[PDB]
Design a protein around this ligand. Sequence first.
Ligand SMILES: NC[C@@H]1[C@@H](O)[C@H](O)[C@H]2[C@@H](O)CCN21
Length: 850
Amino acid sequence: GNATPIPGYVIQSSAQVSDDSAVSKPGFPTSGWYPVSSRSTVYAGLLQNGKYADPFYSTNMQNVPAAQFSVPWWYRTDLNVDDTSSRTYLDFSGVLSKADVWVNGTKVATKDQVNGAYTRHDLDITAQVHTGVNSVAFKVYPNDPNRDLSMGWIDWAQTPPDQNMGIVRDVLVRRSGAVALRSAHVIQKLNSALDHADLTVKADVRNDSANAVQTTVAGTVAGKPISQTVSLAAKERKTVTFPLVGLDRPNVWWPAGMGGQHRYDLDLTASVGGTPSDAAKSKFGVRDVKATLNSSGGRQYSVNGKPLLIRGGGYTPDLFLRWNETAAADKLKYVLNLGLNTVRLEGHIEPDEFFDIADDLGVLTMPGWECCDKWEGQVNGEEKGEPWVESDYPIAKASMFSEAERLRDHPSVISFHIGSDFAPDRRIEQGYLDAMKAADFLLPVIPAASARPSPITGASGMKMNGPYDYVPPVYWYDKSQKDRGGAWSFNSETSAGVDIPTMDTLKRMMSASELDTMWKNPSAKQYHRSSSDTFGNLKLFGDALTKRYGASANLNDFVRKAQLSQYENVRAEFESHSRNYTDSTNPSTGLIYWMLNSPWTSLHWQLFDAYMDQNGAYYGAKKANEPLHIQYSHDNRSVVVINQTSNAVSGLTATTKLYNLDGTEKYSNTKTGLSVGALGAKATAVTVPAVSGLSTTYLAKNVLTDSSGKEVSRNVYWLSTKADTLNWGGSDWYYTPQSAFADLSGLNNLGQSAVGATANSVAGADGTTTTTVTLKNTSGGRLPAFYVDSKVVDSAGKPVLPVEWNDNAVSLWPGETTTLTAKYRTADLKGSKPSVRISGWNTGTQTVPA
Ligand SMILES: NC[C@@H]1[C@@H](O)[C@H](O)[C@H]2[C@@H](O)CCN21
């Protein structure tokens, strides 16, 4: 029943090994070999040993000699074995790109067999293995994402010097008797009422002994006893199907906020001769998922019979695949703190623990294969990625089987994308469908993330029309342009491009000269945007910033205007899709922001940055996705209430007020007694009329109060009398240009106001600290404290990360008070007392103790 992951390896280039067979013999000298932990790429391992400088800073990464990664590298460990009574197995995946496998001097498998990042292998090594010290070595071959059915980085970042070559999941050393137990899972079916479920337990048994046996596979599923006895010839594998098991009132798994996230347990032992031979424990969820095309042809998801607007972002792991379980939980928690329900994974499909965590938190996942390299090389034409040869087809098929087998019992998984930009052809699709069938993977199969259909599964129901770079907020409200990225159908991957991180992050990722160049010349290439020429610079963003907010006075000015621009755009991006979700015709059915986070330190395509800091894009998404939310439509001036919760709400008041930058109220409306249905339904409070007398730049304050009088949503907009308009005719694939620009430059001259702050910190029994901060606009005038940003910092004024606020980037009118809560791990203070740093657009900066 034993499965023990290999803790670590020493690695070295094959340049230093002239007899392969000598690596895996007990006693082979490893003078100068680099010690690495489990799940390390080669570069990750060399970084761990301090061999190269931090690639998150400047062009450090450019300075790594890449040539050394065009040959094999070895991963070697010893393995103590006290006994050869039990058989021995290597069970693993995550080899990029392929490897030879050696045990004690014998080559047990070649790189023709062990090939493909996602392919699992189960190598019986009983023959080679002896008592005492054993050695095992992988000779891992160079990775080329266009040639290998592997992982590559598209245009998200810059190419990692080793191209991730190595072993990026665990290798398990399994022991067991004559019978090996594999592939235990539970098929689960819920009635439409959600009060009864039927369970089919399936589990493979394999007799690897030389003699025929009887085996009993027994254990528990969801608290219920199960038992089957079968015969196995020598070397025979059987799939055991257990009789149906009824489960009354199942603790149904729900997305976050819609209920609990219970997983049930399956626990099994294969015995031989009234003696345990192998055992496996796993978990599953009781949850129904559907993804169907609506009458408009848009892909529509529903969980346990409840339709959902998918609101999420494209997730990426670390650029060098450095794995850390807490980091993964921390990233997934941010999804919830943002109010998002989903993460998309375009390839780079994470280790299991990532999905246990998503399961435990109720964050929905949309895994799948990636575009723009080998996976799509047979269908994607001149796009990078090599046409397939015959040997590719089984690797591809086996990869789906292995992934489908990993993922089938994780309730968070809602579909698998078998294509990204291009749908697979018939042969390739049939190989995926058969693989999924054989794995009992029963989830929706989405043929592509673009509009392109597959020959069997058919239409995707999704759209990939861009944009991926600067568009103004009103663009997101377009339903007129069918080749564009407005709020309709299912937006599988889109954003407004550049997302300048916080000043603290910037100072950690870029040099003074690099930062100088960023604001002065946005047209210049940035190593920390992308390797692609199309997205190598910040020009479009730079141009729009200057035009819309006014020319940048200095770096501080640029960055402060970037956050406003990012908050403004991401907010509208999400808000538009929330509003249009309940349209009769061509509703929005999904939005995946490109992207949730970055593989590394970046300037684009992110909500939270590599260090988990939180900027304007972060707060904008968080604002847009509040559970009970008031918003302003950039297209038609409608004030809309959105209810993301699972129950209808009543007796709401929606209050809208416009202010000039001198603080003069120019419009007021109070809409009492609104009702709004559950899970994304909306209500209209008012359409703001054309108000005469507004300053060119002005403010809109939207406030939502429940029937108890509690303020439940506050939303402040900086608007212009001068409209954003689009030159549609002049679009290309990645953005639509502007024919005219809004004038928000008024904000440059907004008078100073004040705040107004007091902070206290409680150190909990769960290892977390809560810092509470009460803010008050203390000014004696009529000017609001606009865009007030609070940060939990240590004694040196360095932000404490990760962190989770109930709310932030707030705007308070004179006399007004809000109380904010920040939760974080007490140990992440590293002994410091907590403080709070408080910066407003027009309030300067102060730090208070906490
Ligand atoms: N999977 C679609 C790809 C993304 O992987 C890529 O980052 C983005 C842009 O290059 C436009 C195409 N789109």
